[PDB]
Design a binder for this molecule. Structure first.
Ligand SMILES: Nc1nc2c(ncn2[C@H]2C[C@H](O)[C@@H](COP(=O)(O)OP(=O)(O)OP(=O)(O)O)O2)c(=O)[nH]1
Ligand SMILES: [Mg+2]
Ligand SMILES: [Mg+2]
Ligand SMILES: [Mg+2]
Ligand SMILES: [Mg+2]
Length: 341
DNA sequence: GGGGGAAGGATTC
DNA sequence: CACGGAATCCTTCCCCC
């Protein structure tokens, strides 16, 4: 099997550059403004200029301003990035029917048939990069290997505007050389847990009682890491299906007052239902972020689909359940729909 | 004992 | 000072054959 993974470079920012070359060369930071005051919120992403000085997805916008007071700060326009992405995705289908869009800017393609070896794959990669750049003016990085995981790692190593192939030889080397923290699906929480166990590399998972591993990080994550190291990981490329549609917003100020929270909640329901399109959900969860940035939720699954009126009333109930069951003020409130008919 | 959900949370990206 | 959207996974609990 030969997998070719593609990931758009600093995507949201670069889309902004495409729509405004004047920005190119300058540091760009796409932000998600919350409105609790101004310049409150987080950074969705930033071009590489800006990342050099530490401005990156996740950090508070105020930190960014601090480090780069004169970089350009643009509000995130997701609809636009989505439509550009959808276009690029269609373009990618033309290289394989077997395609897995894993995020708004990445996909894994199974080109085992289309190509005969890594030499051609690399050429198919170039073809793809050029096609995308040519057609959409978007640069992307490509990763190619025997399975999705290593394809992803390949592109991570070649970022930005790169393309890399990790052959069976290199896969054997990485299993022994790659810091397990650089392995997809392993965040800072599982990373540290792996160290308390002495594991710093994939191979290390082969020198510990499964039951112990299964103990520390759960069976799923254990079998995942083990199969990878056993060079036996082989998950296929499959079309992913939306299972949840929701929305969540930040309130101007914290609160435990229902009438003060409702307009935010209802706003989130309207937007969610719009996104539902013609999908009918049988489940709904109200999600709340408390003052201490903790996340709490309460939901319910109906035997039938949920109408907007029903979601309106049921959501207030679930919110009341939250407020009655949690003494903390609420910072962010949202709703999520799932289990579509 | 174990199937079959469901609910609430945790981790990752 | 920290948004937002979703998937997957884990634990707990309940109904009952
Ligand atoms: N709002 C928000 N959006 C994010 C976050 N992380 C990623 N995104 C969005 C915007 C990113 O451009 C896009 C693609 O993520 P990547 O993981 O591909 O980062 P990006 O493409 O920006 O840079 P890259 O070349 O992949 O290293 O997804 C986040 O933490 N918050
Ligand atoms: Mg990217
Ligand atoms: Mg990506
Ligand atoms: Mg990782
Ligand atoms: Mg918690």
């Amino acid at each position: 099997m030969i997998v070719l993974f593609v990931d758009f470079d600093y995507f949201y920012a670069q889309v902004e550059e495409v729509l405004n070359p004047s920005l190119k060369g300058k540091p760009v930071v796409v932000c998600v403004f919350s409105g609790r005051f101004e310049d409150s919120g987080a950074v969705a992403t930033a071009n590489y200029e800006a990342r050099k000085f530490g401005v990156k997805a996740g950090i508070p916008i105020v930190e960014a301003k601090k480090i780069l007071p004169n970089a350009v700060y643009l509000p995130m326009r997701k609809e636009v990035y989505q439509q550009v992405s959808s276009r690029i995705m269609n373009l990618l289908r033309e290289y394989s029917e077997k395609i897995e869009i894993a995020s708004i800017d990445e996909a894994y393609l199974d080109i085992s048939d289309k190509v005969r070896d890594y030499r051609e794959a690399y050429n198919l990669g170039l073809e793809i990069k050029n096609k995308i750049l040519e057609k959409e003016k978007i640069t992307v990085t490509v990763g190619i290997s025997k399975n999705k995981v290593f394809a992803k790692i390949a592109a991570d190593m070649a970022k930005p505007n790169g393309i890399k192939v990790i052959d069976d030889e290199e896969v054997k080397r990485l299993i022994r050389e790659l810091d397990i923290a650089d392995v997809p699906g392993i965040g800072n929480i599982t990373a540290e847990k792996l160290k308390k166990l002495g594991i710093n590399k994939l191979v290390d998972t082969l020198s510990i009682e499964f039951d112990k591993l299964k103990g520390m990080i759960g069976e799923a994550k254990a079998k995942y890491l083990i199969s990878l190291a056993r060079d036996e990981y082989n998950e296929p490329i499959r079309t992913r299906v939306r299972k949840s549609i929701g929305r969540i917003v930040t309130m101007k100020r914290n609160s435990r007052n229902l009438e003060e929270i409702k307009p935010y909640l209802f706003r989130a329901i309207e937007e969610s239902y719009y996104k539902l399109d013609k999908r009918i959900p049988k489940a709904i969860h109200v999600v709340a972020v408390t003052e201490d940035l903790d996340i709490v939720s309460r939901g319910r699954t109906f035997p039938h689909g949920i109408s907007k009126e029903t979601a309106y009333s049921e959501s207030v109930k679930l919110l009341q359940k939250i407020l009655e069951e949690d003494e903390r003020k609420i910072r962010r409130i949202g709703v999520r729909f799932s289990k579509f008919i």
